[PDB]
Amino acid sequence: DFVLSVAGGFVGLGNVWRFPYLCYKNGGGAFLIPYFIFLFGSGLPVFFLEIIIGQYTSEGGITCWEKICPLFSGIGYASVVIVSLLNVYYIVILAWATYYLFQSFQKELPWAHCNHSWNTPHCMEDTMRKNKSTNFTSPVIEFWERNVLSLSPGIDHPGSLKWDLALCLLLVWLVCFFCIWKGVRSTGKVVYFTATFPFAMLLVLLVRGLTLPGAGAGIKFYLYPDITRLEDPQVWIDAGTQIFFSYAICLGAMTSLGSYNKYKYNSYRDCMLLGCLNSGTSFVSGFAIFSILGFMAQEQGVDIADVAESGPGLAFIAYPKAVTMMPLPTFWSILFFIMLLLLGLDSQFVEVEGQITSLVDLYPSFLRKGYRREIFIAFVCSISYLLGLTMVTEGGMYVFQLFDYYAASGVCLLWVAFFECFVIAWIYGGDNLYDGIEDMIGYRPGPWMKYSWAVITPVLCVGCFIFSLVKYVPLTYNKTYVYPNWAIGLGWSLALSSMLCVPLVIVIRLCQ
């Protein structure tokens, strides 16, 4: 059962969706070096740490933190907050994918050309800019902004709700609802179809994506860094949080994976073999999308920095462009739109039940297996559905960025990641942990992650935090929109809701 969730909750759309966006927004290749140092310094170390603690305790995420130390036990509650706030917009990511999929059930793709009612008259076809109001946009960009989101001018103007997204969001929630209620495994039928279908097509996208004439500009922008961007701290926090995002760590779902693994079982190899591949697929997917970005870069005459839209949903623009350029677009458009669900639902299936199994034992005597649990699954889905309706609003894209940058990223993941390595290294003792691991996997793991949990990762988490404090640059959308002061406070309160889980519990735990 553990292997199934590895292909499920462990694998996330952020590898193919957020990773190219996070790299794109933070310059180009200047993202890669912080990505790699954060990976090799904390990511794989803390990944093996949380897997091994879940295996050693053979219990849940919340209970393991208490067992290691009665103090600092709020990491589990923070993880529950993070997974809920992650689900509430991951589900609307899948809703956007499904709405796109339904729109692709046509002879001609809607974003192939912009001659429809919704498209702005200033829209202009992609190919003819060079064959022949200087600001000219692209049909695919417009489709995502208006037909899909109908983005409002500002967050202070919500606007009318888009019923088309709501029904699509209704479908994905029900799909997640029935499988969990019926006890359906994350991978339907044969795991191979849920596994080889993603890997094959990312290669398919990679093959033509690299074949595109503009791939040379994209790869150079993807790989070559800028030292100037390294000074500005937001590239560091984004690179780190991508590590805590793609590997779905500091969520507590992977802790259940450890309990699933046998107490006497070598999980060390499984951590790094899957961890390196997860970065490899993310890196490989970077080549395809950035080549597509490079392909559109030379051919609109616009720089690579502003050729794309610097908002979440980049994977909803680049690859849909590629499939239109790829022969027989309708067949390829559906398949890529299918797997986006196949990459997301399994992630959703594992992670959503992650807190469900975390909450059933958290509040016993009322969540018994049977009548009480079925309403709870409906209860948790319904309350999250209503919270998910904020993004269905025309102005909900601005709300969407708030969760993405604050609820399950930014300082939120750095703070919890610090306290995860802090408790083991100093309070529990890294040597005490390794003493079990020698008896668990059969041999001593390398001291390198012990030092990583000791100084490297604590400095990596702490260093970016103060760098953000002194060099506080407010978050922006599409590098052109500034949120109001109250909007930032709403996003921070979400982080502070995850922040105060730990500091309050010690105050809570000391009183009795």
Next chain:
Amino acid sequence: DFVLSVAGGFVGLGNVWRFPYLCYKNGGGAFLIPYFIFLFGSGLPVFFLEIIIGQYTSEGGITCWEKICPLFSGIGYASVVIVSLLNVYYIVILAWATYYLFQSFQKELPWAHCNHSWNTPHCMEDTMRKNKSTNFTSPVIEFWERNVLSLSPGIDHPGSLKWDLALCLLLVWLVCFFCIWKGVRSTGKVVYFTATFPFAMLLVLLVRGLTLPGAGAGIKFYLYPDITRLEDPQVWIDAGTQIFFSYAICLGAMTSLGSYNKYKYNSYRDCMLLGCLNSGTSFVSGFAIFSILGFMAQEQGVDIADVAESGPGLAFIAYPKAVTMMPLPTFWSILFFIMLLLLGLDSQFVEVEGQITSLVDLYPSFLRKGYRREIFIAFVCSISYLLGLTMVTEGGMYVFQLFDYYAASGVCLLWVAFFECFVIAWIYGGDNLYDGIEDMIGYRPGPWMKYSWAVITPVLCVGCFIFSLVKYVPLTYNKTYVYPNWAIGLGWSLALSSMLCVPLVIVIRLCQ
């Protein structure tokens, strides 16, 4: 130990060397369909067959054929002949790789430009043909033909021996000699370095290879087929033999792999997981090289059919071109030249000892473990070294093609593959085989390979044989050179040496 040889003898240079050549010589995409039908019809079926029989008998290749049936026991002897005739030129393939590697230990690669003594004055630089004796050649083409082979005008003119290749061939034989004598495993130190280094760089070659502006022509030529080429039978036999070559089947080395696997062990999954990947890596490598071929195709102004040299050694032309175009050519040239040994030596290490373990028990009372075996390893290497000196001669490239097309390919592999599936399906009985397999791997394998061994594979082997008989087109080099009648007879006698192993043994076995 079985897994080590999977990364060793099972993986061959023919995936990255012979597969792109065989596809290139037989048109373009017209090679793929016969490749795939032969794969799914015989390749994986007969692969699982030979693995499962090696596992069931837990013995050697020669002994297993006798155990299944006293008649038709010459398949083992034929396999020994095939592995010896394969080694004798696989080793000089590695010798060419090493000579190239030693020539690459310089600031400027010798084939980057042709301004040296050996290069013909009619040679001309690659880049300037379009910036500005119509037949103009390429510096990389000349380098392989003269500096590396000094190819003679005809096979009837051997010419002086090239001492530079002989010492390089001496090095590789010694390298294979010491490891086998010292009992060194196929993969040195950590298997990961011998495994991740090949896979990483083929992606590296793929990344820029697809990035090359001419990749569009190459992929279209790689994928789009021609029905006209399908009529001419040589595309069929080459596609089939590539299956029997890349998977190293009908050699008897993989039979030792079956004996290594536990009697009660599910080897069925290991066969298809590794088999599909072997085709996948071959197919993926096809994209990189043909894009390189497409890259040079548009940029010399010559058609894709004749842009390259239609002789064995294509992987010694395309990729060495790519590394020169790839920035910092010296660093990349060495690494690709290292792995060609790393892909070949492990293949050599497993296969050469394959007959050694096959011959030690074949002739007991004289090949005892100790003094008798050490001279035999020297004896087998020395006699093969002298036979390998034929290719070191300036005219040995024409000899080289004779082994490649006859000794370990062509009708040679079809004839043995037919008799492998013939004995199990009719004499032994496919149902009798599956009865064990149900008790071996725990469940019944799919009837599909049973029918494959019954009618599909026998028709596939038989059909191409008569098609070659009636439509007999003599072998040619670079689609421009015709061998003399005696040269063809010498090549056929080599096949007939492998052919007559079976028909004689029944005549031999019936007398006593």
